[PDB]
Motif scaffolding. Sequence first.
Motif, PDB file in Angstrom:
ATOM      1  N   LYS D   4      28.977  28.232  47.381  1.00  0.00           N
ATOM      2  CA  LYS D   4      28.048  29.275  46.959  1.00  0.00           C
ATOM      3  C   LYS D   4      28.228  30.662  47.610  1.00  0.00           C
ATOM      4  CE  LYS D   4      24.418  27.287  44.420  1.00  0.00           C
ATOM      5  NZ  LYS D   4      24.825  28.353  43.443  1.00  0.00           N
ATOM      6  N   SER D   5      28.845  30.733  48.784  1.00  0.00           N
ATOM      7  CA  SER D   5      29.101  32.040  49.388  1.00  0.00           C
ATOM      8  C   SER D   5      30.226  32.024  50.431  1.00  0.00           C
ATOM      9  CB  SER D   5      27.835  32.569  50.039  1.00  0.00           C
ATOM     10  OG  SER D   5      27.464  31.718  51.108  1.00  0.00           O
ATOM     11  N   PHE D   6      30.813  33.186  50.693  1.00  0.00           N
ATOM     12  CA  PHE D   6      31.819  33.287  51.740  1.00  0.00           C
ATOM     13  C   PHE D   6      31.408  34.336  52.767  1.00  0.00           C
ATOM     14  CE2 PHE D   6      33.991  31.598  48.108  1.00  0.00           C
ATOM     15  CZ  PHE D   6      34.912  30.697  48.606  1.00  0.00           C
ATOM     16  N   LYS D   7      31.601  34.009  54.038  1.00  0.00           N
ATOM     17  CA  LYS D   7      31.463  34.961  55.125  1.00  0.00           C
ATOM     18  C   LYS D   7      32.827  35.614  55.340  1.00  0.00           C
ATOM     19  CE  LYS D   7      30.102  35.029  60.085  1.00  0.00           C
ATOM     20  NZ  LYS D   7      31.496  35.242  60.578  1.00  0.00           N
ATOM     21  N   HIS D   8      33.877  34.831  55.123  1.00  0.00           N
ATOM     22  CA  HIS D   8      35.246  35.284  55.300  1.00  0.00           C
ATOM     23  C   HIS D   8      35.788  35.781  53.960  1.00  0.00           C
ATOM     24  CE1 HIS D   8      39.513  35.318  56.203  1.00  0.00           C
ATOM     25  NE2 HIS D   8      39.287  34.981  57.459  1.00  0.00           N
ATOM     26  N   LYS D   9      36.034  37.089  53.846  1.00  0.00           N
ATOM     27  CA  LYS D   9      36.489  37.686  52.583  1.00  0.00           C
ATOM     28  C   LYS D   9      37.931  37.321  52.255  1.00  0.00           C
ATOM     29  CE  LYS D   9      32.429  38.967  52.365  1.00  0.00           C
ATOM     30  NZ  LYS D   9      31.461  38.375  51.377  1.00  0.00           N
ATOM     31  N   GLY D  10      38.691  36.910  53.259  1.00  0.00           N
ATOM     32  CA  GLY D  10      40.048  36.478  53.000  1.00  0.00           C
ATOM     33  C   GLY D  10      40.018  35.132  52.292  1.00  0.00           C
ATOM     34  N   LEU D  11      39.016  34.314  52.608  1.00  0.00           N
ATOM     35  CA  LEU D  11      38.796  33.046  51.909  1.00  0.00           C
ATOM     36  C   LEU D  11      38.299  33.246  50.480  1.00  0.00           C
ATOM     37  CD1 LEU D  11      37.373  30.443  54.429  1.00  0.00           C
ATOM     38  CD2 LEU D  11      39.685  30.938  53.770  1.00  0.00           C
ATOM     39  N   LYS D  12      37.281  34.089  50.312  1.00  0.00           N
ATOM     40  CA  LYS D  12      36.713  34.367  48.996  1.00  0.00           C
ATOM     41  C   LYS D  12      37.839  34.778  48.048  1.00  0.00           C
ATOM     42  CE  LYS D  12      32.298  35.936  47.224  1.00  0.00           C
ATOM     43  NZ  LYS D  12      30.932  35.929  47.927  1.00  0.00           N
ATOM     44  N   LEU D  13      38.777  35.556  48.575  1.00  0.00           N
ATOM     45  CA  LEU D  13      39.895  36.074  47.798  1.00  0.00           C
ATOM     46  C   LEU D  13      40.903  34.987  47.381  1.00  0.00           C
ATOM     47  CD1 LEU D  13      40.501  38.818  46.719  1.00  0.00           C
ATOM     48  CD2 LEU D  13      41.625  39.418  48.842  1.00  0.00           C
ATOM     49  N   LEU D  14      41.221  34.085  48.301  1.00  0.00           N
ATOM     50  CA  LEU D  14      42.121  32.976  47.984  1.00  0.00           C
ATOM     51  C   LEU D  14      41.481  32.060  46.950  1.00  0.00           C
ATOM     52  CD1 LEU D  14      44.884  31.624  48.836  1.00  0.00           C
ATOM     53  CD2 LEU D  14      43.441  30.081  50.266  1.00  0.00           C
ATOM     54  N   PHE D  15      40.184  31.826  47.122  1.00  0.00           N
ATOM     55  CA  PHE D  15      39.454  30.894  46.292  1.00  0.00           C
ATOM     56  C   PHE D  15      39.274  31.384  44.872  1.00  0.00           C
ATOM     57  CE2 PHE D  15      35.820  28.648  44.564  1.00  0.00           C
ATOM     58  CZ  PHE D  15      36.119  27.349  44.900  1.00  0.00           C
ATOM     59  N   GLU D  16      38.790  32.609  44.726  1.00  0.00           N
ATOM     60  CA  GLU D  16      38.388  33.089  43.413  1.00  0.00           C
ATOM     61  C   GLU D  16      39.554  33.674  42.631  1.00  0.00           C
ATOM     62  OE1 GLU D  16      34.925  35.627  44.019  1.00  0.00           O
ATOM     63  OE2 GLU D  16      33.670  33.807  44.121  1.00  0.00           O
TER      64      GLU D  16
END
Lengths: 92, 93, 93, 91
Positions: D4-16
Amino acid sequence: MRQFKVSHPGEMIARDLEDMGVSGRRFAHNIGVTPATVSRLLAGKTALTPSLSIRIAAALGSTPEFWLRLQSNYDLRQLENQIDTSGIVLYG
Amino acid sequence: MRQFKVSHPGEMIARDLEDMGVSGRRFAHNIGVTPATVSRLLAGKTALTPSLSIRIAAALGSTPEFWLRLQSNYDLRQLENQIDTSGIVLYGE
Amino acid sequence: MMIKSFKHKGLKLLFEKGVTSGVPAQDVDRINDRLQAIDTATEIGELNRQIYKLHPLKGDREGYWSITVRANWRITFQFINGDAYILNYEDYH
Amino acid sequence: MMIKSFKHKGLKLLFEKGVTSGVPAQDVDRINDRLQAIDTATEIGELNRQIYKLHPLKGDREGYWSITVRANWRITFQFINGDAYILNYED
């Protein structure tokens, strides 16, 4: 949203065995499968079937259901827009 | 407590087709699968695969994941006393 | 979803022990199919097949849902946090 | 376990988006795998594999969990109900 890249569970398992120091041959011996089947699996060339999921979970943990869910999730992604349902009447 | 009897989704689909008044042949034609395969499905003699599941949800509703999971759950149940894990080592470190 | 409790003792009996004495005989498979469906869905929308005629209940049964077994017969349950409670088999006229 | 959310924007980017600019170039597959597991598991016990060294946090970050990517690097997330929040890649 949804995960951009969804891996074939076999390739994940392959990357995990490498980080472990377990070779395909050794893993095959352990889970009671032919090295030929396992190598096709780690390449992502055969599906991770229910019979495999029981064996694999016996070795790498989690539940057989989890490993099967990975296969399904991947299978349905791989099938996006591959099947023309244009086409099929939805019974009302 | 887990469900005692788990049906093959094909046979559940058989019973649902009966209640809607739809024959095997007419159902086969609609989802675009050969009657030979559809008849093996409704007898629970072949598995409900990802391809069929997409076709089937196009007619009977729910999501493809759902039909696939019925199949998965059934399979695992059928294999529960057929595979000896005795046998297999759970890797540690 | 997690089927956590039964209001209907015959359902509990069919579900847990696979014994059919507590449910009307014509509905044994029809009912087991429905429980398998509820047991398998991960979302409520996966029960939204046309033949189930899934709809929520209002009144003092808010957060309850029902699906159709056959003309005039329903299975109901209360939906709490992804769990199903008070599973029931009732008529509706 | 729906993420539901990411604190780490490098993760959000890999994921989405499948973009690798925000995470170590070498750990891309490893991290994508772990995210795929977190996304696929329906219970927390399903992530209790050996290589993941799943364990809860104290907490402070209570209701937070971590799994190991490699060495000292962990992925963490807060667990409320059946959902994963505030995914992070630390240490």
